[model samples]
Target: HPDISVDVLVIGAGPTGLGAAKRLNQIDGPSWMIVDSNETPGGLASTDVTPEGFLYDVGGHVIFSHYKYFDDCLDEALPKEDDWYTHQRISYVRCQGQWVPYPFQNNISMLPKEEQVKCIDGMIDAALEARVANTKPKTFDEWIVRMMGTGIADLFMRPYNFKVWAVPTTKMQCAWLGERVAAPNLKAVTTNVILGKTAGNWGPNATFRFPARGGTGGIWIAVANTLPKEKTRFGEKGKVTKVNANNKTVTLQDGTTIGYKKLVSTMAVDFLAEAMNDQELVGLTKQLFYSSTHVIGVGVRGSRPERIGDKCWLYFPEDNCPFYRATIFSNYSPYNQPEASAALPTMQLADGSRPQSTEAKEGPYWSIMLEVSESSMKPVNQETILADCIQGLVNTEMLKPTDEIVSTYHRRFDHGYPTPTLEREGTLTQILPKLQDKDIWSRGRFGSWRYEVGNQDHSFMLGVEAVDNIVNGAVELTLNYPDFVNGRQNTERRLVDGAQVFAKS
Candidate 1:
């Protein structure tokens, strides 16, 4: 006999798995349990703390939710107003020793005069073509040219996207670019360039929220706490070693066997197939490519630089920096680093040289979080990653070589950003339905393998919708139609008095 049995078994306690458990618990209509290979609840949504007391998220996680259900769930989890901090999205693009307001394509007015002429000239041509062309852009490369023209594409979009995705824009599809990319207006851009004015804030997330205390992971931990403790299992002890998909049973690392009527897997599809020992599925999963994320954090023992004031995040398109993007991590929350009174020793200089003193001292601290993407196409120097990142900071002018570094953090998440490859949709179309046909719903950032819906908000709803689909065959708008969900406020769903109740779609 199996160790235990559940009507619903959710694997990998990330946002999606937790989402499934949340819905199951709310309905009180299923015998369900959630399990994960890690001790913590958040997967990629998890946070890490340096030995010296600085906190960093998996990468640069910012909360810009679009779904009502997602908001309602988070509110229930962190109910107190003091639980969060709201910030206007002050973002920029670091180019040629200047900070260009974000949507760099629209704000090339900050670029050199010659470059500005090139950008404006291309925009004019692009505008003319757009007026005549009717067919949709076929690939991300085409999308960039259509939106910002050849000048901006060649200058920023193409190269920057390659650094971030570790895959060429030509190899990615354009459907995921709904509100994510900004298409420049020729007249507005030209006017700004001529007047030497920078474009203001743009994008769906002009404002965002962050937890006041625990970083991005805190929000999910609070969300997980609302569920019954007895129904959740985590860490190596809870790891699912083997899954017998044919028999609907799983073998845990501790030799506990579980039988389930339905399964919701939040593990990467490739990893999930390996656990099942399904050679055919594994082969299919290989076609989908992904890059790993290296999150490097630096905590400095000094006052926050005035130049870096209130900046949320900045992009790096040029090779002046090793990281593709840098988040002013300390600006997000006052508690992100050690308090001014907390005594800490200097680990080393920002240049990785000897510290001025080994003695511990009180700190007025600040931090910067950097993200570097790596894959077979674009590799990273694991040995010198820390040193390289510090140098990159100096290159970007965020830090000087002599800056005192009180703490440093370097962690590599093997599965970081889900690459939206040309072949992604084709592979997912085959895999997701095949699993669903067998009473399994494999969905999440890594689970669904769709970055378009991989944020905290989307991951939660993927779980909620999966439960609804299983219970009443409700349509999963986020899963099936990402563009639809992203373009509008998803209000057909709601959370009422701790239960997930919905209106007609």
Candidate 2:
């Protein structure tokens, strides 16, 4: 019933909400129901299909979990042998028309002689300065100069990060870069350069798993399926219109008011503040910052070219491309794009000319998905973005100028990345506890707004731990101790069949 009341209310059916609902159901204690404005369960993780059958996610979402519980939940969802496809991480950074293996700082050998000498020189200088410096690096830009030096910092880190975060490195804080950035060692990098070699896969997601059947969204849908049908609400009636914490109730779009004792909101924290109608919280949320993401996809009618062979994702720092990252979406999973036998009409020529034939054509197909980040600091041209991106693909040699563009996709997610700014820590320190006092737990990528713990695994555990704290006073190690949880194997508790706590390896 729309007028119903429950012990706990979960808003938004994304991974965070699903994590909460799954935990709530496993305990089988509190009365709760999860709701989402969209008909589907996955939030940013959801996938969309173009009119011509190309599939694209909000952005690249590869799962490299930090907890055994996260592993157990995913396994329970897509348990069959053929459910997942694991792939080695094959990443590179495009510089001066050459593909330099990732960790550009360590791969200076790939650059021309003049550039390599400059980088090595700066690196040595940076190493010397580090010997007696007592104070920490003041900003991300400072951190880059201190660790990577000026040459590599300018050639890659500065421009590439600006393209990725849409925020200047100097404006971003360095704390969130715990394991995300591969800080190179002076000796290892110099040796690799002298030996004319490159560093191998270097981060948490050195290798990753993708859903074999659906895009990233499939994982969340399968997770939600494990919960009781009666405890979930979606579609029109589930669109939250207002949240009245004073009365401990939320009103849906249809004027249905449901009351709850506690609220776990996976919606963006700022959005949550608006729903709650708390001017004070709204002001606090203003200090938090974020950037919008535009995921553009291109499906071509041809076999995978040798140039793009097995390359998982590539980074673009040069001005030749508008996107910072490009993922060979089809390479991750065979089912990501339509089969060659599937007929798809050419939307346009690679040069933006109209296709000669509107008739559907048959044959092999391949796809590439790109991400462009934008913010007030760096705005975007919505009108020509698609055309610009297609031209960029050609400019970067990812697509042939004469290649047939079978399908195209572009979507803008307003709140894509929850940026870690200088003011973020101070703001969240105040906002989180203030909401908790009102019996509201805002937890998720945008909910908690802690990018260090904002991945799928961390967001899921934030929900799980939120529930644990509610039920048994369990510490949210993932939230409180990000380094601790991320650095070690969390084998404490694992879920079985999404119903019982069966321990694991």
Candidate 3:
């Protein structure tokens, strides 16, 4: 007999699992329980703290809400004004020793005069071709070339994306580009280049919020706290070892077995298939490829540098830096680093030289978190990643050669960003239905494996809607129609305050 029995079993305590549990709790319809392999509730959404007191998220995560349900849960978690810090998203792209406004295609005026002319000239041709073109571009690479022209594609789009995705644009599909990529305005680009003006602020997440205490993970932890403790099991107790699809039983690492009528799994789909011991599903999962992410963090002593300013995050497309993006982690929250009174010893100079003083010193601190993508096609210098990143910082002018480094962090997540490869949709369409046919709902960043709705907000809703679909056959908007949910404000359908204020036009 199973040790525990429930109407529904939610696996993985990350945002999505928590979202499922939260919705289940609200309805009180099904006897449900949420489980996670980690001791903490935040899964990939969790945070880590260095020995020297620097905090870093899995990568650089910011709070940008799309649905009312997302806001409702977050507000309930950290309700008080003091619980969060709101800031304008000050972002940039580092290009040839200059800071260019983000969406580099729209800001080519920041480039050298000759390069600017090339970009504008191509954009003009692209604009003319766009009017006559009837069919959509076939691949992401083709889409960029057709939309922004070959000049911007070669200068920024192609190389920068390769660094982030760890795969060439030609291997990716263009359907997922809904709101993620900002298309260039032909008139704007032409005028900007002619007048030597740079376009500014071009995408969503213009303004975002963060938890005052913990990193991005804190928000989810607090959200988990809002749910009943009895329904959530974390750490070793929650580790799922085997799944009996026929019997609807899940065996935990500790030998406890849970029998459920339905299961909502948020773990990576590849890992989930292994637990089920389903050869066909596993084979299907193998067809879906993904790259790993290495988050390297550096903590430095002294006041925040002026050159870095209040920039939230900066992109690196050129080989001057190993990382694709760098977040000013310390700028997110004052508590992210040690207090001014907390004395910390310098380990080394930013240039990799020995510190002038080995003795501990007191005062202000700052940090930068770097992201590097790795795959079989694009390898990373794992042995020298930390040191290489520090040197990259100095090379990019983010840190001085003599800057004192107090602490450093390096971690590798085997399953990081889910690639939206050309074959991804086909694989998911087959795998997800097969699992669902067996009463198992696979959903989350890696669960559903759809990059379009892979952020914390979408992951959470994927869980919430999975529960609703299992119970009431509700539509899974975020999972099925990512472009529809992302293109407009999704609040009209999922009201937070339980009031219908505005009608959809």
| lDDT per residue as tens, model 2, 1-505 | 4498999899998889889998898787888888899888999989999988889988777888888988999999999979999888888999998888887877888888898899989888888888767788768888888888888889998999899888888988887767443343789888988999877565555688999977999999999999999888988988998999888989999888899998999999999999888899999998899999999999999999999988888999989879999999989888999988999888888888888889999969999999999999989898889899999999988888889999889999999999878778999999999999999989999989988898888888889888888887889888878888888989877775334534322
lDDT of 1 by residue, 1-505 (tens): 6899999999988888888888888778879999988888998888999988899998788888888888988999999999989888888888889888887866887778888888888888898888788688778898899889888878787888998999999999877877444344888788777788876575455688899999999988998899999999988888999989989999999999999999999889999889989888899998888999999999998889898888899888888778998998998999899999999988888777898689998889999999999999998999998889998898888998888888888988888888888788999899888888888899999888889998988998899889888876889888989889988998867776334334222
All candidates: TM-score: 0.96, 0.96, 0.96
Query: What's the count of clashing pairs in each model shown?
Result: 2, 1, 1
Models, CA RMSD each: 2.7, 2.6, 3.2
- Candidate 2: C-alpha lDDT: 0.87
Candidate 2: list runs displaced more than 4 Å: 179-184, 202-205, 496-505
Clashing pairs in 1: 38-235, 444-448
How should the candidates be ordered by lDDT, best one leading? 3, 2, 1
What does candidate 3's lDDT look like per residue over 235-273, in tens digits?
888899999999999999999999999999999999999
Give the number of colliding residue pairs in candidate 2.
1
Question: In candidate 1, how many Å is residue 279 off?
Answer: 1.1
State candidate 1's TM-score: 0.96
- Stretches off by above 4 angstroms in model 1 are 179-184, 202-205, 497-505
